[PDB]
Structure 1
Amino acid sequence: PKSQVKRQEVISELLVTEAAHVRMLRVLHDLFFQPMAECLFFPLEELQNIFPSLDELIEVHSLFLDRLMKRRQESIEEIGDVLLARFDGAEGSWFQKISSRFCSRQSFALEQLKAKQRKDPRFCAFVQEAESRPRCRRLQLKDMIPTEMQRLTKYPLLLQSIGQNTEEPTEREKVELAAECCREILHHVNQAVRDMEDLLRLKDYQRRLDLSHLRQSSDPLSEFKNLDITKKKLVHEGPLTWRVTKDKAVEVHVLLLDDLLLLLQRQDERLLLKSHSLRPVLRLTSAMTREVATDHKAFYVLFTEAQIYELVAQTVSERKNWCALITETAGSLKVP
């Protein structure tokens, strides 16, 4: 007291909220996943990408719910040991593995479901009917899926304040270490999320890429034979206008990647890279941006034979934003 009331409260909050989460996850499973498996709305492989590890994700939280209850029941001093048992060592590692799998596919999972609802009325009516079942507690499926992430972001907050309210030192170390683990996990999942969100997107572009032109120029482009972008970092993308001369302008979708800049022409579902002059592909290791005094909406990118690429955004703010991003990424790149 007063350290103790808070410590007990927080430990309570953690147990209760852990149960609610298991409960939801089970609803998600029972009312959505399993029935859809049985109605075979998707081929199963795919359902597994929408709910990447639901079955075992339920278990991991379940096992924790279980430790926490056993501990409460047998009394609360000491909780560190329990915490470390879920977030640290091998069980630590698994929890991460399982929760991050499932979290990464969130965005994917959602658009998949949205597509199907807007495309197939049998399925849309299914989801409605399911969403009206009491066990939903007024959450929609779209509300359910992203709770796993939320839950992960809650753990450091909860653990941080059990620790800072632990009087006895060696116990507070445990609880502190545990909390640290949770931030390690959160930080990793967050990353494995962007890695997936980028990946799927880059694989998308990579099969839509009309590569024929580089294989055709005598332009010693020969480095992009063969160009692969699936395993690279997508820093930024956006429509722009590409004033190849002050008489001719090209409509273009730009990808700013870790180390290359790509100016893509959109032609039906295709995306072309055409040498039309000035190349469409560019090694950033040399890049540099400038304002254009006669056009607050336009800027220049230069490759330090010049090599001038006059690009224009719709809004002034966005072209401020573009230069900002290029020069910054450009800078991030090291000289041998």
Structure 2
Amino acid sequence: PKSQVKRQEVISELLVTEAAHVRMLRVLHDLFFQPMAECLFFPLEELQNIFPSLDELIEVHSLFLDRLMKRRQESLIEEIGDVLLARFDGAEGSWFQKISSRFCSRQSFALEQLKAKQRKDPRFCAFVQEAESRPRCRRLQLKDMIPTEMQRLTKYPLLLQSIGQNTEEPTEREKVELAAECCREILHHVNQAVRDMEDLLRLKDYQRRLDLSHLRQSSDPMLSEFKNLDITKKKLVHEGPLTWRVTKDKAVEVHVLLLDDLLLLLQRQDERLLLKSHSRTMLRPVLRLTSAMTREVATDHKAFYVLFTWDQEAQIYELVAQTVSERKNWCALITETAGSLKVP
């Protein structure tokens, strides 16, 4: 006691919530995933991208539950670290990371795919509503069960920390603290994979739509690299519509992508996204960020300028947002992204 009552309370909580987590994942499989496969609402390939490796996800949380239960039955309990390391360190740690990360990365894709089906297909709408009326859902909707894996990853450090900072015996406490650290690395690697997947799917759709016919037609030297442009594997820092004032007398609606080292000024033409050099030639739509600098426009608090210190011609992009905050945010983001870039 009482470091130790708290130690036992949190070890119990870990067990009891790991069980709850297993049960929901099984509900998600039995009530949604499996019957969706059988009804074939999506081709199976699509269904697997909505629930990436649900079977094996259940298994890795299951094996964790069974070890925790095995240890609880055979002990109050001293020594839990070895069990925590057995799920979160070494080859098992790696495997749990791989499987959880596959699932979590697809969360927001899954949510949208399900939501678009419900809106579009009354059959599938009635199907989800019926599954959600069932006692085994415990009042949770399909949209609440999916995020649950990512929620649980965020919980592991909280739980392992407490246990750790309430463990008296030193070698045990090191084990627990090592497992807490493993859960932090896991959460971090998953958080990074979620962003990579979110960015990847979004940029891959932008690649499909990207029209490069003008950069190919240009024999302007500065645009010869972007031939050939492939934004697919780049980091999408921020994006949004802005109005682009090529002059005081010519405004161009543009959708701009701030990647990690390029600024892309895209023209929306129906579904397509164009990179038009259009300029009074001389103002280009794809710009290297290494040299970028933003500035306020006093006559217009919604506007800003972007200039490239490397542009021997200099070469002002006057862009305007719908609110002051939003321009403020564009300037902050541009500056900070450019600020990261090393110089030769």
- Normalising by the smaller structure, the TM-score range is over 0.9
State how far apart, in whole Å, the 1-side matches of 2:277 and 2:116 are: 36
1:303 CA drift (Å): 1.2
Q: For 1:162-192, what per-residue CA distance to the aligned partner results, in whole angstroms no more than 9, with x for missing partners?
A: 0000000000000010011000000110000
1:4 CA drift (Å): 1.1
State how far apart, in whole Å, the 2-side matches of 1:187 and 1:303 are: 34
State how far apart, in whole Å, the 2-side matches of 1:57 and 1:149 are: 12
Where do 4+ consecutive residues of structure 1 move more than 3 Å?
Answer: none
State how far apart, in whole Å, the 2-side matches of 1:314 and 1:4 are: 57
State how far apart, in whole Å, the 1-side matches of 2:60 and 2:291 are: 49
In structure 2, the partner of 1:300 is: 305
Over aligned residue pairs, what C-alpha RMSD do you find?
0.5
> Partner of 1:237: helix, strand, or coil?
strand
Q: For 1:125-170, what per-residue CA distance to the aligned partner results, in whole angstroms no more than 9, with x for missing partners?
A: 1101101011000000000000000000000000000000000000
State how far apart, in whole Å, the 1-side matches of 2:204 and 2:328 are: 29
Q: Counterparts of 1:1-336 in structure 2 under 5 Å?
A: 1-75=1-75, 76-220=77-221, 221-277=223-279, 278-304=283-309, 305-336=313-344
1:286 CA drift (Å): 1.3
State how far apart, in whole Å, the 2-side matches of 1:171 and 1:286 are: 52
> Partner of 2:127: helix, strand, or coil?
helix
> Partner of 2:27: helix, strand, or coil?
helix
1:208 CA drift (Å): 0.5
Q: For 1:79-128, what per-residue CA distance to the aligned partner results, in whole angstroms no more than 9, with x for missing partners?
A: 00000000000000000000010000000000000111101111111101
1:198 CA drift (Å): 0.4
Aligned-pair identity in percent equals 100
- Provide structure 1 residue ranges, at least 5 long, that are not aligned to the other structure: none
TM-score, normalised by the number of residues in structure 2: 0.97
State how far apart, in whole Å, the 1-side matches of 2:51 and 2:72 are: 32
Q: For 1:271-328, what per-residue CA distance to the aligned partner results, in whole angstroms no more than 9, with x for missing partners?
A: 1110111010101111111111111110100011111110011101111111111111
> Partner of 2:268: helix, strand, or coil?
strand
* Number of residue pairs the alignment of both structures matches: 336
Q: For 1:46-76, what per-residue CA distance to the aligned partner results, in whole angstroms no more than 9, with x for missing partners?
A: 1000000000000000000000000000010
State how far apart, in whole Å, the 1-side matches of 2:295 and 2:3 are: 57
State how far apart, in whole Å, the 1-side matches of 2:192 and 2:62 are: 25
1:3 CA drift (Å): 1.2
Which stretch has the larger CA shift, 263-272 or 57-66? 263-272
State how far apart, in whole Å, the 2-side matches of 1:169 and 1:134 are: 45
State how far apart, in whole Å, the 1-side matches of 2:328 and 2:136 are: 49
Q: For 1:184-225, what per-residue CA distance to the aligned partner results, in whole angstroms no more than 9, with x for missing partners?
A: 000110000000000000001000001111000111111101
> Partner of 2:58: helix, strand, or coil?
helix
State how far apart, in whole Å, the 1-side matches of 2:115 and 2:298 are: 45
State how far apart, in whole Å, the 2-side matches of 1:289 and 1:3 are: 54
State how far apart, in whole Å, the 2-side matches of 1:311 and 1:105 are: 34
- Provide structure 2 residue ranges, at least 5 long, that are not aligned to the other structure: none
> Partner of 2:265: helix, strand, or coil?
strand
TM-score, normalised by the number of residues in structure 1: 0.99
State how far apart, in whole Å, the 1-side matches of 2:339 and 2:159 are: 39
1:43 CA drift (Å): 0.6
State how far apart, in whole Å, the 2-side matches of 1:295 and 1:222 are: 35
State how far apart, in whole Å, the 2-side matches of 1:299 and 1:19 are: 54
1:37 CA drift (Å): 0.4
State how far apart, in whole Å, the 2-side matches of 1:331 and 1:14 are: 43
1:331 CA drift (Å): 1.3
State how far apart, in whole Å, the 1-side matches of 2:130 and 2:107 are: 22
> Partner of 1:245: helix, strand, or coil?
coil
